[PDB]
Symmetry: C3
Subunit: 257 residues, 3 copies
């Protein structure tokens, strides 16, 4: 009676334990299914993160490098200086220490300063720059080069300049510099006392002097002609006197007899 | 009691199988924990990696800010809202908003600058030009020329004055600009009417006038000599007439007696 | 019944140990489940983080576009496939493929431009130069000069002619306006030397000298004519006297006739 019932009790306890263990196995399976999802998720994330690392490293190597250097492959500077400063509206500043303070200006070169509107500065009042390899200008608003200035000034007539920089204006020596002379052509007639005289004008002045001589001359030729005419009158009077005397001498000789 | 011993055997059999399942379950739990331990570590690694990517990405975001939006690096800067630069020509360079380097191997420098001819650098356009400032005097033949250099080519030279119309070619004023005059040396003798004459020619021309005067004096001297020739003849005839009369007067007086 | 009661006690003890094992197992499973929840959550968070990073990186890549590959920003641009610019000199600047700023504080501007002297801006090289265009006329002494300015300056210039070989022809200086007009030369001093230009005052004095010579000479001629006129008047008086004598002789002879 007591034992048979206790055996049944144990048998039911075993039954319930078997069910509990099966329930526990099921829980382990449910957990494992989540761990499987997590393991897979981790795998997906490892891939995505190494893919982003690569993309970030490429961004770093490229555009990162232009930030720190301030240069691209085609716009380069070699400098430790302070940033360029495009201060003015629509200004452009190129090079460390450069400052384009004025509207629509360009400061070009390290430490260049553009402080007037609509200009391109290639330096400053303390450091200027020559501009080199400039081809001869053609259009009116092209820059001119030294060779063009030299060609344009060749043949220019100049005074001598003294050592102190003053010009000696009191003499203008023409000619080749070794004894040669220069003919000055296309000269107008002098009007003021200190104007140069031209050749037509010289010739005209000789002709005036000769005309004055003729005017004086012909006054004396009138006197000389008056003397010439009077002289013929005297000659006729003499011939008449000689004739008279001949007749007197003949008359006296006939009185003699 | 046969049923009781049968049930005891059944109980023991069930217990053996339960004990076996418990051992299997304990192994299963360990398999799961080992994977969970791996996943936990994988997650900690991913947290660290993602945190690092975040910092590398934030640093890049800080660096590229002004470069993408303002188109400017620390040494290449512009202050503008306008249209992109446009390097259209092969090997061209365009710097500044609205700039257009249209032609081959050209450079458009500055906001709205336009380069429309091959192998040129434009500092502006036909709608807006720019002076170039802080240019040091050119030395090489292909260096640019500054205003100082042009002014120095003018200084000390002989130049026509301008009107304001522009150059007045009708007068060339020499001298020092304050009353002083200029002696012009090495001047060749004038050939054409409009050539400047030299002092040698002036002197010769005075000599010609005086020679002309001397010639006319000579003509008058000969007319006079001719008059004095007839005059001496007259003088001799008179002396002879006077003599005749003396002899007549004496002859008449002797007749009187 | 005592052999059986013993086996029953033994069985109850086995069940006790099994119960204790099962309770230990449920505790372990609770512990694992808690860690799995933390992991699941951490993964969800990571998924969002990583997706946000993806978007930020993509937006970076799109912001840049081709700034790296073409070396150009929206405002500093070149169209070229050549070698990198090279700013070699201290404080130098190089702009354009193949450009080389070799010298200190220099600027090489444009494709293949070379700056090889200090403190210069080169717009080309010894083998390829460039004109500089749309330059407004210089005002300041250190402003660049344009072609219009050079031409205006040259137009006011007095110049000898240049031969084809570049020598200057000093033998002729042609003034005038180019067509056929002439130039009056002002502020000229009196000539001293035979090859000096003469001025108008000097011409006028020369005319005076000549006129004076004429007056002196004609005065001397006038004196000579006067001298002849006087001697002619002497002859006239002698004749009048001779005529008078003859009148008296003729009257005297007539009185002798009676
Ligand atoms: Cl997990």
């Amino acid at each position: 009676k007591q034992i048979e019932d206790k055996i049944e009790e144990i048998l039911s306890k075993i039954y319930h334990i078997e069910n509990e263990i099966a329930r526990i196995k099921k829980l382990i399976k449910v957990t494992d299914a989540q761990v499987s999802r997590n393991t897979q998720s981790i795998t997906n994330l490892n891939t995505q993160v190494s893919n982003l690392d690569t993309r970030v490293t490429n961004i770093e190597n490229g555009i990162g490098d232009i930030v720190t250097t301030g240069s691209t492959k085609y716009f380069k500077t070699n400098t430790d200086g302070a940033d360029a400063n495009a201060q003015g509206a629509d200004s452009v500043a190129i090079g460390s220490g450069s400052i384009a303070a004025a509207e629509n200006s360009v400061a070009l070169g390290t430490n260049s300063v553009a402080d007037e509107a609509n200009t391109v500065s290639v330096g400053s009042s303390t450091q200027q720059r020559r501009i080199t390899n400039v081809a001869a200008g053609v259009n009116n608003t092209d820059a001119v080069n030294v060779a063009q200035l030299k060609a344009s000034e060749a043949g220019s007539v100049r005074y001598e300049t003294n050592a102190d920089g003053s010009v000696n204006y009191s003499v203008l020596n023409l000619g080749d510099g070794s004894g040669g002379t220069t003919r000055i052509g296309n000269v107008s007639a002098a009007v003021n006392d200190t104007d140069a005289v031209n050749y037509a004008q010289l010739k005209r002045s000789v002709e005036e002097a000769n005309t004055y001589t003729d005017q004086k001359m012909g006054e004396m030729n009138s006197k000389i002609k008056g003397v010439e005419n009077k002289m013929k009158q005297i000659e006729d009077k003499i011939e008449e006197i000689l004739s008279k005397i001949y007749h007197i001498e003949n008359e006296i000789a006939r009185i003699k007899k």
